[PDB]
Specification:
The PDB classes it as ribosome. The structure is cut from a larger assembly and holds chains A, B, C, D and E. Chain A is built from seven helices and 15 strands. Chain A is an alpha+beta fold. Chain A is globular, with a radius of gyration of 28 Å. By secondary structure, chain E is an all-alpha fold. Chain E is extended and about 40 Å long. Chain E starts with 9 loop residues before the first helix and ends in a 7-residue tail after the last helix. Bound molecules: magnesium ion (19 copies). Chain B binds four RNA strands through strand 1, strand 2, strand 3 and helix 1.
Chain lengths: ~400, ~240, ~120, ~325, ~45
RNA sequence: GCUAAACCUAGCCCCAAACCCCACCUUACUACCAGACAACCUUAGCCAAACCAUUUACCCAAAUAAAGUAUAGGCGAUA
RNA sequence: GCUACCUAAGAACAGCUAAAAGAGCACACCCGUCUAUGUAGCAAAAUAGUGGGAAGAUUUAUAGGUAGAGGCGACAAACCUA
RNA sequence: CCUCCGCAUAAGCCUGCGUCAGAUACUGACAAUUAACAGCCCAAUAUCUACAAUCAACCAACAAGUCAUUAUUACCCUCACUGUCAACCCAACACAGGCAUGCUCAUAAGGAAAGGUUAAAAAAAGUAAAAGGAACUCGGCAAAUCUUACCCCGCCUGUUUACCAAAAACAUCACCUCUAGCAUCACCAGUAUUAGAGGCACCGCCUUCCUUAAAUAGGGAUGGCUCCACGAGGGUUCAGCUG
RNA sequence: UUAAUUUAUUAAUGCAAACAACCUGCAUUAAAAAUUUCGGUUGGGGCG
């Protein structure tokens, strides 16, 4: 079955006048008249050259002629790619071993109550209420508005800890930063072009979480595979691409080391929003991409086991549900499935609050649920603060 | 009228396509089919009825993972998003197809009969006689056209030479080259018969509208009548 | 219902009223977001001379003598502009005398005219 | 039907017109690591950050200066939080709307079936400051309530229509940037970014040099009056119950390079004719001339960085409630 | 109840009786030709 | 004695002779981007035949005459 | 540009009762049961009260389409500019 | 003293109660609506996009619900043009009609039922009424009150004769019959559990007395049946209520 | 409509024509239609 019905397909041009089939004579066309007439032959116009040149009337050359066109087809993961297998596919692509829960090294940074924010719950509740109810004159703010607001206000609340932690002065949250990292996986060359937003950069690299012994123990772990789904599925197969490793910044940039990638799924529509598993996969891929760009910038473009692993964190949220990730890139030798493997600690589906009532539900003239968040969980904010404080 | 068919998309896709209702109207704008109009807005999911469609630069039998089984507004059967290699496609789901199941699409006519597992597609030559089938092609590579509605199942009645006799759900025999592919099992949504519309409003939701003057010929509907022969004219309307 | 009154941009719905103009020549184009980009070269630049010291005035004294109207012609212009040089060089390649084979290559092409007024 | 008062406006002498609409007297004057951070933000937005898509001068404001101003506000608030405890609990709003609706003066309906009838002149400001800081404790006064100043509010003899200013009818909103249920209901500082339509270059080409400071001053007067009036009406004051304490807010207005600084004290909400017939108070706006934060940015260098502008920003951020 | 059959809309007026629609068919061209022959001030609507 | 009443050319009829700046097909009267759709094909019926069913004169390329003749025609109206 | 049906993309539907309803009462809105007035009228079909529906087979704005022996019709030979 | 009125947008209209001067909201002249609101857009080629909405979190589904972006290649100039009035439009009218949407829910907005008088008849609307309480009448129509019970028809919600018929008629779920083995313009981007047409009617089962005093009124002693519910349908009735 | 006249047109076949499809001509059968008519006497109508 062929798609596209004939009536919609472009109409076939009318048959050429028989006068054109007679070798010796020049047909008399309405070309001289400069307008159509039905009783004269239709001219054969030579193709027009000066057309597709003006900037506002430009036609791009065929993809084959573009400077970066390559016969070998790369598989790019961009911000709007949704992995079918999700976390498993991301782990295979990045040669990563998954560890449930955040590492104790970062989780201990908030165990002591000194790091606990004064009026922490009050401030977080005010942040949630402002994002979800008080943000606008409109009664119910949309996700496109309350997800960035909740993230930024939480980041400010964490940054308020500069009192206890002067090391927090050596960091800055940049927006619209874009990184690109290419690497091979079983003769398949994969690129990640991470655009996202809210890259938390620090002047100092994050300390490694996994020790040499754990990194070596990753050798025994077998990289889970899925069949018949190829790991390439849902990745943009593109022949136009650049193999350069771009960290997103010019050389000499202060705060060169990525600290946390804040990915937010703020689409108002559920189909336009990532599933939680696909969001975790995107977090894995973006953290791996930033770490790999850093590694290629620092230790050169050589496939090898990293003596100093690169650690990149990421927080992926939909405004209510958060996912926390710490990714340790400890190898740039990705092509083989064997050897030491990168490792990611993920804490999944940490919901800051169960639900938010913008309107007071009234049954039989009785207020059942008051306006505000329900099922608020300070533990998720503790984890968020721990991730922010890591490295300080 | 300025009617252009909505079926203009040329490239297969998984995304539901916005389909325009017709109201039973031709491209001329006149009613051609009565009783159609309105109903819930629908999106069309392009079904790949050629189950043995090996991916680009690939060949041979291939397996596919059932990502999900979904209700289809445009069919009695429910459909299945199924993914193989690096592609995803919509196929017609069989009765017991589940998410996470594995499906085989083969062009191999084995000398022995292949074990017929529900949901997989084999050439009709490879199936045992008496197996229930659906999504049957008429010609090799044409694409499934027969036994596609919910709960339907043809029977592989016979296989002789390179020709197989299939019993269509209308209990009519059909001859097809044994190289034509069909999938094993009955189509899903087997309870489609038992659904009760309940009220006229549900049919109106389904897009069926009450329509009269369905014939447009002079005098409207007129049942066929036997025209008596001249010898028999004397007995047509004998009085009591 | 008014067939006789002129169709202007004040009459239709919002799309009509936005689309129709009043004869003003275009100055630029519209990009994405309906942002208007104004092209400087599209704007008519008024070439206004310096009138300081100019002796002519809007009116002429009635004391000026009457004359007979003699509209300038191509023959007269040729005689008063090219004929002297032609004679002086003939007594002793027409581009030397002023003729140009083609208007292409000139800023002010005489035909098709490509300048204002 | 109400006049849409635009803080960021192309109109000439709009500062004078807004002074009249607002009953505001404008008064000229006032009532190292930070430098490194400011330079870092500037260079991050201008040079260091890699742009996949070419930056066009028609969007330079929105794609360069807006992130730059956001980074300045956020990082400076973080760094000055130890030196200003109130700034730690403050809410930092990014482009949250500020709406103020008020009535100022009267007009005889000139034409129509309502001709000859009295109608109040209504004004609405719908601002969206690039950044703003909201606190739960009010800032201190800049000058006592009932403070008299010899400078007189400009008098406008023409209708507000003569200043390009148009009427619409839509929701009347009084908004501080958050709903009334928000405890952080007082204003600390607003950070405004002039749009590309109000480029200094375009203003210089089309107008005098004083029109640039007019644009800055009008934006300040309108925005700060709206914010302080919304704060007062959140506290429950209006034209018939005038404020018992002055309401204070600060603002910095930048084009990306040039910064100007404004302090505003709202002393009156009694702007109607009835409430203003015998009202001696008047709102006050202290302002500074626009000064360039930097002279130029060449590749990796910020040439001509002005420390005084950054000190003024820090001073505003360091202002505290009592 | 009746009499207000005319519910004006300039889009419909121009799309139904305008110059472009009149010229779009040979019959409408003859409509315009008849109006021109009669000397109508308004050829189309 | 009011309302009125009256008027004569404005033109028209039939012959002859003679062959008679700019804008605008998009929503016309709209300065300024990818065309292609580009037209052709017996008139029918009213009516007469006292219905009606075959049939029933109609810009012809010299007026007259041949001649309403030869012919045609429900051999009839009529042509 | 009425009306009938359809197409595309919109919009409206208080409150109470009930609980995911071609649900109940009843606004807006749609209609037009009965009575009265009106009958060259306010009106070439209206008014007042009463009444039916009122989250649906609902109502409705916009643009488009189907044309006369044809269209359209939940068939009343209804409607297709009184 | 009055108003589901008013103010705005849309649509429509096109200067149609602004000023002045002549007339009796007319004629003529002069003036006026200033863009931020709104309209007027997009440089393409490819390739992408399964995951509704309903406070979207539980629960609840079926009728299955456009949201279109990214990579490369081009690109550097910048705010033009148009709508902006009114007491307004469609109904031949300064027409009690028609007229989408957002807000105000009785108005902060908008208006005036009485030209003056008299106080006849008849007429219209309204209010009150002794005693009685349907005796009126084709009929309790209308009005006033508030109930009861049962038949016939149609299963029900809906639809219809725009302008004398709203129904028992048409439709309708349900069922039956007939026709059709199939692709690129309807049916249908469908495939016999489908599609088209016709019929039928949801469903389910089995195969002389009473009423009044008087009662041409009412009720009861494949088909045959079964009226659950519903009805401005058509009959009858108790009680009450009433000019 | 089992009134009269047709089948131009479609749909089937058949025969020729072009070498199965497609198409032309000529027939036959249908469908869909088209055109046309409504004698006289007897209160009317039925049967006469
Ligand atoms: Mg209409
Ligand atoms: Mg006759
Ligand atoms: Mg409701
Ligand atoms: Mg209901
Ligand atoms: Mg209907
Ligand atoms: Mg009937
Ligand atoms: Mg009328
Ligand atoms: Mg009056
Ligand atoms: Mg009177
Ligand atoms: Mg009484
Ligand atoms: Mg009686
Ligand atoms: Mg009684
Ligand atoms: Mg009686
Ligand atoms: Mg009654
Ligand atoms: Mg009924
Ligand atoms: Mg009903
Ligand atoms: Mg009627
Ligand atoms: Mg009626
Ligand atoms: Mg009786």
């Amino acid at each position: 079955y062929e798609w596209g019905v004939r009536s919609t397909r472009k109409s076939e041009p009318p048959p050429l006048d028989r006068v054109y089939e007679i070798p010796g004579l020049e047909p008399i066309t309405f070309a001289g008249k400069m307008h159509f007439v039905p009783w004269l032959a239709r001219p054969i116009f030579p193709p027009w050259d000066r057309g597709y040149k003006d900037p506002r009337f430009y036609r791009s050359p065929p993809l084959h002629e573009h400077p970066l066109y390559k016969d070998q087809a790369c598989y790019i993961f961009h911000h709007r790619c949704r992995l079918l297998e999700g976390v498993k596919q991301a782990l295979w692509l990045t040669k990563t071993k998954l560890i449930e829960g955040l590492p104790e090294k970062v989780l201990s940074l908030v165990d002591d109550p000194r790091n606990h924010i004064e009026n922490q719950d009050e401030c977080v509740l005010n942040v949630i209420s402002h994002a979800r109810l008080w943000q606008t004159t409109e009664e119910i703010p949309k996700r496109e508005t309350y997800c960035p607001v909740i993230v930024d206000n939480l980041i400010q609340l964490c940054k308020s800890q500069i009192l206890k932690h002067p090391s927090l002065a050596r960091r800055i949250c940049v927006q619209n930063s874009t990184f690109s990292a290419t690497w091979n996986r079983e003769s398949l060359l994969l690129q990640v072009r991470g655009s996202g937003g809210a890259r938390l950069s620090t002047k100092d690299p994050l300390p490694t979480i996994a020790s040499r012994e754990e990194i070596e123990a990753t050798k025994n772990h077998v990289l889970e595979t899925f069949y018949p789904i190829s790991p390439i599925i849902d990745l943009h197969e593109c022949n136009i691409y650049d193999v350069k490793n771009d960290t997103g910044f010019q050389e000499g940039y202060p705060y060169p080391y990525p600290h946390t990638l804040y990915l937010l799924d703020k689409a108002n529509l559920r189909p336009h929003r990532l599933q939680p598993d696909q969001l975790r996969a995107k977090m894995i891929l973006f953290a791996f991409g930033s770490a790999l760009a850093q590694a290629r910038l620092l230790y050169g473009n050589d496939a090898k086991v990293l003596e100093q692993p690169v650690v990149v964190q990421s927080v992926g949220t939909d405004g209510r549900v958060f996912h926390f990730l710490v990714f340790q890139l400890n190898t740039t030798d990705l092509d083989c499935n064997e050897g030491v493997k990168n490792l990611a600690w993920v804490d999944s589906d940490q919901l800051l609050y169960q639900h938010f009532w913008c309107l007071p539900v009234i049954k039989k003239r009785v207020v059942v649920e008051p306006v505000g968040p329900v099922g608020f969980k300070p533990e998720t904010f503790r984890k968020f603060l721990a991730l922010y404080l890591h490295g300080a | 009228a300025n009617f252009v068919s909505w079926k203009s998309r040329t490239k297969y896709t998984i995304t539901p396509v916005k389909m325009r209702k017709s109201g039973g109207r031709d491209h001329t704008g006149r009613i051609r089919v009565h009783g159609i109009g309105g109903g819930h807005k629908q999106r069309y999911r392009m079904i790949d009825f050629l189950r043995f469609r090996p991916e680009e630069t690939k060949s041979g039998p291939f397996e596919e993972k059932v990502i999900q089984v979904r209700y289809d507004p445009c069919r009695s059967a429910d459909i299945a998003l199924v993914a193989g290699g690096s592609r995803k496609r919509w196929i017609i789901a069989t009765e017991n197809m589940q998410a996470g199941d594995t499906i085989l699409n083969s062009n191999h006519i084995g000398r022995m009969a292949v074990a017929a597992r529900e949901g997989d597609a084999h050439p009709l030559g490879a199936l045992p006689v008496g197996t229930l089938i659906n999504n049957v092609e008429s010609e090799p590579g044409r694409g499934a056209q027969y036994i596609r509605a919910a709960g339907t199942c043809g029977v592989l009645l016979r296989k002789v030479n390179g020709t197989a006799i299939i019993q269509l759900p209308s209990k009519r025999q059909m001859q097809v080259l044994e190289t034509c592919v069909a999938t094993v099992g009955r189509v899903s949504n087997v309870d489609h018969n038992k659904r009760v519309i309940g009220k006229a409003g549900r049919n109106r939701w389904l897009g069926k509208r009450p329509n009269s003057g369905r014939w447009h010929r002079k005098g409207g509907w007129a049942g066929r009548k036997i025209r008596p022969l001249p010898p028999m004219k004397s007995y047509v309307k004998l009085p009591s | 219902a008014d067939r006789m009154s002129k169709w202007t941009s004040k009459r239709g719905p919002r799309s009509f009223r936005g689309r129709k103009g009043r004869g003003a020549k275009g100055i630029g184009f519209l990009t994405s977001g309906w942002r208007f980009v104004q092209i400087k070269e599209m704007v008519p630049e008024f070439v206004v001379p310096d009138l300081t010291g100019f002796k002519l005035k809007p009116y002429v004294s009635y004391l000026a003598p009457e004359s007979e109207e003699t509209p300038l012609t191509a023959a007269q212009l040729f005689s008063e502009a090219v004929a002297p040089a032609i004679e002086k060089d003939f007594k002793d390649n027409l581009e030397k005398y002023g003729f140009e084979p083609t208007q292409e290559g000139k800023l002010f092409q005489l035909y098709p005219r490509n300048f204002l007024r | 039907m109400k006049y849409m008062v635009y803080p960021q406006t192309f109109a000439l002498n709009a500062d004078r017109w807004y002074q009249y609409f607002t009953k505001t007297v404008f008064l000229s004057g006032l009532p190292a690591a930070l430098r490194a951070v400011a330079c870092d933000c500037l260079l991050q937005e201008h040079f260091y950050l890699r742009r996949r898509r070419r930056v066009h001068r028609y969007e330079e404001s929105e794609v360069i200066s807006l992130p730059f101003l956001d980074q300045l506000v956020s990082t400076l608030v973080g760094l000055l939080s130890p030196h200003n405890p109130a700034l730690a609990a403050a809410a930092l709003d990014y482009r949250c709307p500020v709406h103020f609706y008020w009535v100022r003066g009267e007009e005889i309906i000139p034409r129509g079936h309502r001709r000859g009838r009295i109608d109040d002149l209504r004004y609405q400001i719908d601002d969206k400051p690039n950044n703003q800081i909201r606190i739960s404790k009010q800032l201190a006064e800049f000058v006592p309530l009932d403070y008299s100043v010899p400078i007189e509010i400009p008098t406008i003899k023409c209708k507000p229509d003569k200043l390009p200013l148009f009427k619409r009818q839509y929701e009347n909103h009084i908004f501080v940037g958050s709903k009334t249920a928000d405890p952080c209901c007082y204003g600390h500082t607003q950070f405004h970014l002039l749009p590309d339509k109000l480029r200094r270059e375009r203003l210089l080409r089309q107008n005098c040099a004083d029109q640039i400071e007019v644009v800055f001053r009008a934006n300040a007067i309108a925005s700060l009056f709206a914010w302080t009036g919304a704060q007062a009406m959140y506290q429950g004051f209006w034209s018939e119950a005038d404020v018992t304490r002055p309401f204070v807010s600060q603002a910095v207005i930048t084009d990306g390079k040039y910064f100007s600084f404004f302090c505003y004290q709202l002393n009156t909400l009694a702007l109607t004719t009835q409430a203003d017939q015998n009202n001696p108070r008047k709102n006050i706006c202290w302002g500074t001339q626009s000064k360039p934060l930097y002279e130029t940015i060449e590749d990796n260098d910020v040439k001509g960085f002005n420390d005084d502008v950054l000190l003024q920003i820090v001073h505003f951020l360091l202002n505290r409630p009592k | 109840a009746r009499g207000n059959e005319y519910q004006p809309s300039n889009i419909k007026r121009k799309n139904k009786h305008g110059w472009v629609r009149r010229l779009s068919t040979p019959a409408g061209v003859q409509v315009i030709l008849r109006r021109m022959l009669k000397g109508r001030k308004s050829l189309s609507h």
